Amino acid sequence: PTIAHGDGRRPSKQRTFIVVKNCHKHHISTEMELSMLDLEILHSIPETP
Amino acid sequence: QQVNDYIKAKVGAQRNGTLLRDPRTYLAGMTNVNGAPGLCHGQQATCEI
Amino acid sequence: LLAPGEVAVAGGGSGGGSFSWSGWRPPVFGDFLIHASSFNNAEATGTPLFQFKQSDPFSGV
């Protein structure tokens, strides 16, 4: 909005402002290690205590 | 040549010359024994003229 | 995903299934720690790469 003055000044007409905002992409990761004895055993059926 | 060796000797240059880039780059086993044995005040602050 | 073999297989490894599944071998990767200014990001993912064997010991990059 504006203010009306009694001076002879030039009037700033109706003004509109446009502003854009963009995203930021983030990533994350980690690593594990598993021994193959564990993966192999997990599947085999146990027989002896 | 012997003008150059006379200057380097009386000036105190060529010291601590074992390790150049910051030590985080080097993996391990970097002794860096030559530069110093121990500090009583902390990180040597480089002054320049 | 938790398969006994080298390739992940259906069911969770319940059955052995294909001993060597269609003869598929997983790829091997390689990690490198590059000075970011030495490598321009805009290179497409297809470019073959070449490693110079630096001649300094115990480097990390």
Side-chain angles (χ1 to χ4, degrees), chain C residues 13-24:
Chain C
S14 53
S18 309
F19 31 77
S20 306
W21 203 298
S22 174
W24 168 264

Side-chain angles (χ1 to χ4, degrees), chain A:
Chain A
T2 60
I3 311 173
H5 311 274
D7 193 1
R9 73 178 70 200
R10 57 155 48 252
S12 73
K13 326 269 188 176
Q14 29 189 354
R15 297 168 288 168
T16 300
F17 268 91
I18 293 186
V19 173
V20 199
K21 283 299 179 75
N22 283 316
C23 300
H24 295 107
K25 305 263 280 175
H26 302 297
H27 196 59
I28 292 185
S29 65
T30 57
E31 297 189 22
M32 324 161 197
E33 281 211 40
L34 285 200
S35 302
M36 194 67 102
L37 253 186
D38 305 337
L39 286 180
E40 172 164 356
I41 75 177
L42 271 214
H43 300 239
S44 50
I45 297 179
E47 317 162 349
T48 168

Side-chain angles (χ1 to χ4, degrees), chain B residues 30-48:
Chain B
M30 289 293 101
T31 310
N32 194 4
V33 54
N34 275 295
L39 295 55
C40 271
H41 287 45
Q43 182 177 44
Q44 316 267 28
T46 53
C47 319
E48 281 180 333

Side-chain angles (χ1 to χ4, degrees), chain B residues 2 11 15 18 20 34 41 44 47:
Chain B
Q2 46 197 16
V11 78
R15 203 157 298 273
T18 304
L20 289 323
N34 275 295
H41 287 45
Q44 316 267 28
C47 319

Side-chain angles (χ1 to χ4, degrees), chain C residues 31-41 49-51 60-61:
Chain C
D31 311 333
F32 306 90
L33 219 58
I34 292 304
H35 293 267
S37 68
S38 163
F39 183 88
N40 200 327
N41 291 327
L49 262 52
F50 298 87
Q51 185 211 16
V61 284

